[PDB]
Amino acid sequence: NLIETRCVLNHHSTQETAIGNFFSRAGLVSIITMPTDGYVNWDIDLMGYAQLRRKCELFTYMRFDAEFTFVVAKPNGVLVPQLLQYMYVPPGAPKPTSRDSFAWQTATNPSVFVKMTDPPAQVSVPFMSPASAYQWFYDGYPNMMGTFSIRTVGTEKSPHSITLRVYMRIKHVRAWIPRPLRNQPYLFKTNPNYKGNDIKCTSTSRDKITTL
Amino acid sequence: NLIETRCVLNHHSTQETAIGNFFSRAGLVSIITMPTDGYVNWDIDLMGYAQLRRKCELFTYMRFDAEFTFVVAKPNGVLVPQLLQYMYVPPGAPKPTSRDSFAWQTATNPSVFVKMTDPPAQVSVPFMSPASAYQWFYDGYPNMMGTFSIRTVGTEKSPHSITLRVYMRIKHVRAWIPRPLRNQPYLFKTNPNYKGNDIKCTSTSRDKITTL
Amino acid sequence: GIPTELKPGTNQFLTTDDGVSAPILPGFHPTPPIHIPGEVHNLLEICRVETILEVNNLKTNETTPMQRLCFPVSVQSKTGELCAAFRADPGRDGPWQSTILGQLCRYYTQWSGSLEVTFMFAGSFMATGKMLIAYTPPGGNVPADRITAMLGTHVIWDFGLQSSVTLVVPWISNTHYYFDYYTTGIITIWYQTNYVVPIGAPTTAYIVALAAAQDNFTMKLCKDTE
Amino acid sequence: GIPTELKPGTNQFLTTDDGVSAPILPGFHPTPPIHIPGEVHNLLEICRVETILEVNNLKTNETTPMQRLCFPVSVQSKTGELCAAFRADPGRDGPWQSTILGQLCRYYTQWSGSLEVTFMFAGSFMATGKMLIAYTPPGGNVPADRITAMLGTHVIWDFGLQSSVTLVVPWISNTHYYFDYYTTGIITIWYQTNYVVPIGAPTTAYIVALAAAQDNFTMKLCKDTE
Amino acid sequence: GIPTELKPGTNQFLTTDDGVSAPILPGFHPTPPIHIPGEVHNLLEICRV
Amino acid sequence: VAQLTIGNSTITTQEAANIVIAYGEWPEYCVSVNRFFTLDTKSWAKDSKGWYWKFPDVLTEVGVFGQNAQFHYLYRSGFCVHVQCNASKFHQGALLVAVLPEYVLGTPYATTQPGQVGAVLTHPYVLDAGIPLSQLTVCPHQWINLRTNNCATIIVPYMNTVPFDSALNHCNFGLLVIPVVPLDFNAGATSEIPITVTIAPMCAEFAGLR
């Protein structure tokens, strides 16, 4: 319901629509459970959610950094003094295949060791592509950034269920070549396919052209 | 499986193959358990693993420092408020032979006192050799750096099993006189002996000289 | 050992904290950038291009959605009668959902400024006529006939000479709260003269409506969409 | 009592943290260094020396591995026929595993630059002949005979005058991922003329192949090997 | 790693502590003020009527 | 009315000073390759939906540009596209001519890269990619309106993340021609109106070493 009064006359500053301010906020990108294997693998994926896929696909070539933060607790709030290990596998190194494989002790996969009772750990990741910028649209026939691996430290099964959440901020953003915004529902995470049996119009509908 | 596309044209910076960057990362060098004596002795040994033995034996004379870090927990993750003592015995001082020998209270063996609930302790060790550099290859007939000794503080047996891991970084590295890289499996940790019954060739094998 | 204190506000994770952090790879060198043309520095430079309004958004046109982009003029219609009508709402639903300005104003809360609307004739070369583009200021009422619409603000568009004309909306504003404080007008199209056409040319034509923002259009308070 | 805060990221052990620490022995003085010749400041200065390629890596030569370093030319072979063939892959398996460049590129992920290959004749002084060293650019096909290989890039090596010759590969590249994006060519050896030899000298000879990198060969993204 | 100490008086919430805090919206710009007549700078100017 | 002359191929067009430059940049560096290639003519009917051509896939089987791309590895060029229509003053309609970098389609090799003939869109409201037609004018575009003008020229520079690329796998941009306002006429006139496209490469380099 629209109403009449309270009009504004003073113009606003143009810093509110800078390209850095459009992606400045940090949001949840994944949720990783681990019930009572013992290891998980979550590769870095931006288009895991329908939100922020529609916002990055406004442009074509983007170049940025990242900043991750791992909030970790039990399935219901509480904390216990448990030691953890977050291993970051760069693009081009083999992933751990077991709870006690050789890749957990490789000297070139950097890790962090935190307890559950600490403030959450914060890691920054630089621009990793061999090209000059990422691209969400590749026309030819054949954007990986890495893979996080998380396990509980020990040679013995821990009697605790762990659920952690991953947050991600984006810094020093540059963009190129804008593009129309997608107005159709998604099907997969790789290709821009739509459902051809029905096409949802962009606008809503009204009865006649004269009834405003 | 090799493929065709995605060629690179811009040269990379030469800081990626500096001698400091080749050893810059910190990796695990030992694993020390202690079940429910009570004391352990782990002397400083670089060639404890097959990895980093093949990397230091590229050169002949090296000179560096160290930096150790002691991550300590129970066999399954959890932590209890336990007090610990890490004694560093320099080269030339007698090692502790019992849980309550006289060497635990010697004023010239420096120690650290940490609890299990703290962040891990970090110690740096200078260059200890009487010569100008270490050497992994000595031709004549007759490289010690010290010995760490770890026990639980008290006059009474503690009812906790302890497993700790030791990490080690290398700083201010200089190298001299390069050497061919070893391509045969190891047998012992002192001598460069091989198995003479079979010799593994360096390359793989193909059928004919013309079948590329 | 300098004396320090811990104020309230330690050990908290604020999600909008723009601090610095330890790099995971200190020895790494990223690829140096090259010159790629078409760099966007601000989102308002996308808000100043003319996109197609969807004025003919009837209920029967959902089956063939290509007819929604243009609305017709005809020869059988009388003179002095209404052609089409729509209000200028870049935030709310209706015709402005099909532009690029109506999609970027779903990401924000407040905006204000001026717009401009550009029309374009797409008929045969041999036909001519006249249309009246009347704009009602905000807070007023819709005109009931041609004579009251002439007294307001209006342009006289004869498509026998110019095939395109522009109209400038002076000021809009919005403070959203589900209700929004919204001060906008109404644009109506009036048949000045009838459609006159010689022998052989077709009888119906079509108008395409383009819309874009002005220089002084700003917005604030970023907000995630539905 | 200055006010300080504790951001997220305290009490964590980052393994690549290049900080400072408390020395275990503050009163100790290390031994001052002396001048030892042969100091290595960068690993690329080991990558620019010629080591022996293992071209003759057959399946029968695993018993006597000293024959793998050289491949023969003979007198019974016809003219205009193929002698040996190998591609230039310092990363992947094959002949380049036996060099020092093929062992340092197992410690890294990406590399690019130019190489150079140097051959050397080891026959008697009284014999002579000619060979053709043909290089196929990347993305092409292997030549099927001598006449198509002559149209590409090639040198003409007569070992009656010069006992050694060099060949320069213009550009290679690799981005590893188990699959790698790899753009390299193929080097083939062609019998230009047959082997001509007087009375008393032996009939078979041997070629040794040496390989080394150029000035503009760089690499990045250190990675621990298998 | 500079050496610091924690004196008594940490981790307390003093209600009259006039310190600074982290803003919840760092990118926001508030509305610039205009000239409204009748500004009160001190309460004693109401005590003199 | 002027008459251009590039190489051994001359066209006759109006010297029209209303060209568009894509993003304000001229094609610059990093014998018979600079001429005027003219594709086939597509017939605009009453129920046509649209056409598209992928670049530089359209010029891989034509002329010396077709054989240079099939031998060299690397490739880099700009372009200059000229689209014109020929209709009398009794027909009506409007076309939208816009380029689109990294055009990815949505549901074979005979559809994504059709070659020199071009292909036909099936759902032109969503461009067969899920993005709506009404916001296409954020790209470099030009309106062809049969009432007034019969010409449209776009200058397209090189847009890629790497300075050189292959010419048989990658396709940089696809050019789109969509009839927004349909064609209408009375009976007794020509039912099919032709559309003619003309390409001319600018600042083409090949360093593939063949």
Whether chain D has a CB inside 8 Å of the CB on C198: the answer is no
Residue A5: exposure state from Cβ atoms within 10 A (0-12, 13-18, ≥19): exposed
3-state secondary structure at position C60:
helix
B104 in Cβ contact with B96 (< 8 Å)? yes
Closest by alpha carbon to A210, among C102, C39, C57, D97? C57
For A43, the token pair is: 């590769």
Distance of alpha carbon A24 from alpha carbon A170, whole angstroms? 6
d(CA D162, CA D218): 32
CB A91 within 8 Å of CB A144? yes
Q: Per-residue DSSP letters for C93-120? A: SSGGGGSSHHHHTTS-SEEEEEEEEEEE
Which residues are CB-contacts of D175 (< 8 A; sequence separation ≥ 6)?
A130, B6, B8, D109, D110, D181
Quick one: which of A34, F102, B67 has its CA closest to C38? F102
Q: How many CB pairs under 8 A join A and C?
A: 180
Q: Which of D15, D176, D177 sits opposite A111 (nearest CB)?
A: D15
Residue D102 to residue D57: CA distance in whole angstroms:
15
Cis? peptide before E30, omega within 30° of 0: no
Amino acid at D119: F
The Cα–Cα gap between B28 and A109 comes to: 12
Nearest-CA distance from A27 to chain E in Å?
A: 15
CA–CA distances in Å: residue C208 to residues A44, C69, C86, C114, F151: 45, 7, 14, 21, 20
Smallest Cβ distance to B25: which of A82, A108, A115? Answer: A108
What are the residues whose beta carbons fall under 8 Å from the beta carbon of F18, sequence distance 6 or more? none
How far apart are alpha carbons A153 and A164 in whole angstroms?
16
CA C206 to chain E, closest CA, distance in angstroms equals 45
User: In what helix (H) or strand (E) does residue A53 lie, and over which residues does it extend?
Assistant: helix A53-56
Neighbours of D161 (CB within 10 A): 7
At a CB cut-off of 8 Å and minimum separation 6, what does F84 contact? F13, F150, F151, F152, F195, F196, F198
Beta strands F51-55; D218-220: pairing state: unpaired
String of DSSP letters for D138-196 = TTS---SSHHHHHTSEEEEE-TTT-SEEEEEEEEEEEEE---EEE---EEEEEESS--B
Sequence length of chain E is 49
For residues B144 and B81, the answer to whether their CB atoms sit within 8 Å is no
Q: Give dist(CA C135, CA C133) in Å, integer.
A: 7
Q: Compute, in degrees rounded to 10, the torsion defined by CA atoms F114, F117, F118, F120.
A: -110
* Cα atoms found within 13 Å of the Cα of residue F193, Cβ hemisphere only: 25
Residue F101 · residue A177 · CB < 8 Å:
yes
CA D157/CA D163 separation, integer angstroms: 9
DSSP codes of every residue in D180-225: EEE---EEEEEESS--B--SSS-S-EEEEEEEEE-TT-EEE-----
Cα distance between residue A64 and residue F77, in whole Å: 28
Tokens standing for residue F63: 């002329």
C-alpha pair distances (Å), C142 with each of A211, C63, C71, C86, C145: 11, 31, 20, 10, 9
| 3 state SS of D44 | helix
8 Å CB contact of A90 and D223: yes
C23 class by beta-carbon count within 10 Å (0-12 exposed, 13-18 middle, 19+ buried): middle
Query: Is C179 within 8 Å of chain D by CB?
Result: no
Contact B199 D65 (CB under 8 A): yes
Please name every residue paired with B71 in a beta bridge, in sequence order, or none if there are none. Answer: B165
Record the tokens describing residue C161, joined without a space: 């000479």
- Do the beta carbons of residue C182 and residue A2 sit within 8 Å? yes
H or E element in which residue D121 lies: strand D110-121
Strand partners for D211: D51, D117
CB contact under 8 A, C218 and A11: yes
Alpha carbon distance D56, D189 (integer Å): 13
CA-CA distance, D3 to E19, in Å (whole number)?
9
Positive or negative CA dihedral for C15, C17, C21, C23? positive
Token pair belonging to F188 = 């007794």
Class of domain D1-226: mainly beta
Q: Report yes or no: C124 at the A interface, CB cutoff 8 Å.
A: no
Taking a C-beta distance cutoff of 8 angstroms, is the pair B195, B187 a contact? yes
Please state, in angstroms and rounded to a whole number, the distance separating the CA atoms of residues B111 and C186.
83
Tell me if C56 sits within 8 A of C188, measured CB to CB: no
Contact predicate B63/B134, CB 8 Å: yes
Distance CA D184, CA F209 (A): 12
Asked if F touches E (at least 3 Cβ pairs < 8 angstroms), the answer reads no
Asked: is B1-212 a CATH 2.60.120.20 domain? The reply is yes
Residues after which chain F has a gap (C–N > 2.5 Å): 30, 107
Distance CA C97, CA C112 (A): 17
Under the phi-then-psi rule, with left for phi > 0, alpha for psi from -120 to 50, and beta for the rest, what region is B58?
alpha
d(CA F78, CA F73): 17
Three-state DSSP string of C151-204: CCEEEEECCCCCCEEEEEEEEEEEEECCCEEECCCEEEEEECCCCECCCCCCCC
Phi-psi region of B18 (alpha: psi -120 to 50; beta: other; left: phi over 0): beta
Q: Please name the residues in contact with D28: beta carbons below 8 A apart, sequence gap of 6 or more.
A: B126
- In the numeric block, which tokens belong to residue A150? 């998380």
Chain D from 3 to 32: CB within 8 A of any E CB? 3, 19-22
DSSP annotation of A13 reads P
Q: What is the CA radius of gyration of chain D?
A: 25
Closest among C219, C139, C216, C140 to C174, alpha carbons compared: C219
CB A60 within 8 A of CB A179: yes
Q: How far is E49 from chain C (nearest CA, A)?
A: 41
Contact B74, B163 (CB under 8 A): yes
The rounded distance, in Å, linking the Cα atoms of B26 and A110 is 9
Strand pairing of B162-169 and B66-73?
A: antiparallel
- Considering only alpha carbons, which residue of chain F is nearest residue A136? F102
Taking a C-beta distance cutoff of 8 angstroms, is the pair B165, B30 a contact? Answer: yes
> Shortest CA distance to A49 belongs to which of A60, A57, A40, A41?
A57
* Three-class HEC string of A161-195: CEEEEEEEECCCCEEECCCCCCCCCCCCCCCCCCC
* Start-to-end Cα distance in chain E: 61
The reply to whether residue A60 touches residue F102, judged by beta carbons under 8 angstroms, is: yes
Chains that touch E (3 or more CB pairs under 8 A): A, C, D
Question: Six-digit token pair at B44?
Answer: 């400083």
CB-count burial class (<10 Å; 0-12, 13-18, 19+) for B36 = exposed
User: F96, F94, F83: which is closest to F16 by C-alpha?
Assistant: F83
Distance, CA of B55 to CA of F125 (rounded, Å)? 62
Say which DSSP state A60 is in: S
Tokens at B141, concatenated = 């007939």
Show the CA angle centred on residue F198, arms to residues F192 and F199, nearest 5°. Answer: 150
Please state whether beta strands B61-63 and B134-135 pair in parallel, antiparallel, or not at all (unpaired). Answer: antiparallel
Query: 3-class DSSP state for residue E5?
Result: strand
CA distance D139 to B98: 70
CA distance F38 to chain B (A): 30
CA B53, CA B182: separation in Å to the nearest integer? 10
Euclidean distance between CA atoms F168 and F171, whole angstroms: 8
Dig out the tokens for C167 from the structure: 């109209």
Q: In chain D, count of helices (H) and strands (E)?
A: 2, 14
Among E1, E7, E9, select the one facing D20 at the smallest CB separation: E1
Give A12's DSSP letter.
P
Nearest to residue C217, comparing CAs of C49, C96, C65? C49
* Chain C interface, Cβ < 8 Å to F: 34, 36-38, 46, 49-54, 65-66, 69-70, 98-100, 103, 120-126, 163, 200-202, 204-206, 208, 210
Give the distance from residue E36's alpha carbon to the nearest chain D alpha carbon, in angstroms.
37
Q: How far is CA D18 from CA A81, A198, F128, in A?
A: 27, 58, 52
Closest-CA residue to F129 (of F96, F158, F101, F157): F101
Interface contact flag, B52 A105, Cβ < 8 Å: no
Q: Which residue in B209, B1, B59, B53 sits closest to D53, CA to CA?
A: B209
Residues with Cβ < 8 Å from D218, sequence gap 6 or more? Answer: B11, B12, B13, B14, B16, B17, D44, D111, D112, D113
In Å, how far are D89, D114, D177 from A93, measured between CA atoms? 20, 25, 8
Contact between residue C114 and residue C216 where contact means Cβ atoms under 8 Å apart = yes
**Sequence-distant (≥ 6) Cβ neighbours of residue D144 within 8 angstroms:** none
Picking from B116, B128, B141, B158, the residue whose alpha carbon sits closest to that of residue B46 is B128
SS3 labels along chain F: CCCEEECCEEECCCCCCCCEEHHHCCCCCCCCCCCCEECCCEEECCCCCCEEEEECHHHCCCHHHHHHHCCCCCEEEEEEEEEEECCCCCCEEEEEEEEEECCCCCCCHHHHCCCCCCEECCCCCCCCCCCCHHHHHHCCEEEEECCCCCEEEEEECCCCCCCCECCCCCCCEEEEEEEEEEEECCCCCCCCEEEEEEECCEEEECCCCC
CA distance A99 to A107: 17
DSSP A200: -
E33 touches A: beta carbon within 8 Å: no
- Name the residue of chain B whose CA is nearest to C24's CA: B25
Q: Domain residue spans in chain B?
A: 1-212
User: Are D112 and B8 in contact, with CB atoms under 8 Å apart?
Assistant: yes
Q: CA F6, CA A168: separation in Å to the nearest integer?
A: 54
Rounded CA Rg of chain F:
17
Q: What is the 3-state secondary structure (H, E, C) of A80-116?
A: CCCEEEEEEECCCCCCCCCCCCHHHHCCCCCEEEEEC
- What backbone torsions phi and psi does residue D147 show, to the nearest 5 degrees? -75, -35
Strand pairing class (F20-21; C82-87): unpaired
Are F209 and D137 in contact (CB < 8 Å)?
yes
Identify the experimental approach. Answer: cryo-EM
Closest alpha carbon to B79 in A74, A80, D9:
A80
The nearest alpha carbon in chain E to C6 belongs to E10
Alpha-carbon distance of D66 to D62, in angstroms, equals 9
Please list every residue in chain F whose beta carbon sits closer than 8 Å to the beta carbon of residue B11: none
Residue pairs between chains D and F whose CB atoms are closer than 8 Å: 11
Q: Any idea which residue has 């659920």 for tokens?
A: A163
Residue D101: its H or E element: helix D101-104
Rounded Cα gap, residues A3 and C183, in angstroms:
8
Instruction: Please state the domain extents for chain F.
Output: 1-210
Q: Could you give the CA distance from residue F144 to residue F88 in angstroms, rounded to a whole number? A: 14
Q: Can you tell me the distance from the alpha carbon of D190 to that of A45, in angstroms, rounded to the nearest whole number?
A: 51
Q: Which chain D residues have a beta carbon less than 8 Å from that of C29?
A: 220
- Three-state SS string over chain B comes to CEECCCCCCCCCCHHHHECCHHHCCCEEEEEEEECCCCEEEEECCCCCCCCCHHHHCCCCEEECCEEEEEEEECCECCCCCCEEEEEEECCCCCCCCCCCCHHHHCCCCCEEEEECCCCCEEEEECCCCCCCCEECCCCCCCCCCCEEEEEECCCCCCCCCEEEEEEEECCCCEEECCCCCCCCCCCCCCCCCCCCCCCCCCCCCCCCCCCC
Q: Is C226 exposed, middle or buried (0-12, 13-18, 19+ CB in 10 A)?
A: exposed
What b-and-e string marks burial along D20-44, b requiring 16 or more CB atoms within 10 Å of the CB? ebeebbeeeeeeeeeeeeeebeebb
Contact yes or no for D39/D27 (Cβ under 8 A): no
Residue pair C131/C190 in contact (Cβ under 8 Å)? The answer is yes
Cβ atoms within 10 A of the Cβ of C212, count?
A: 19
What residues of chain D lie within 8 A of the CB of F208, using their CB? 137, 139
**Virtual torsion, Cα B174, B178, B184, B190, nearest 10 deg:** -50
The residue behind tokens 């990490």 is B167
Q: Tell me: domain F1-210, CATH 2.60.120.20, correct?
A: yes
Residues of F in contact with B8 (CB under 8 A): 162
In what side-by-side order are the strands of the sheet with B111-115?
Answer: B39-43, B147-152, B83-89, B111-115
Separation between Cα atoms, residue D200 and residue D126, nearest integer Å:
9
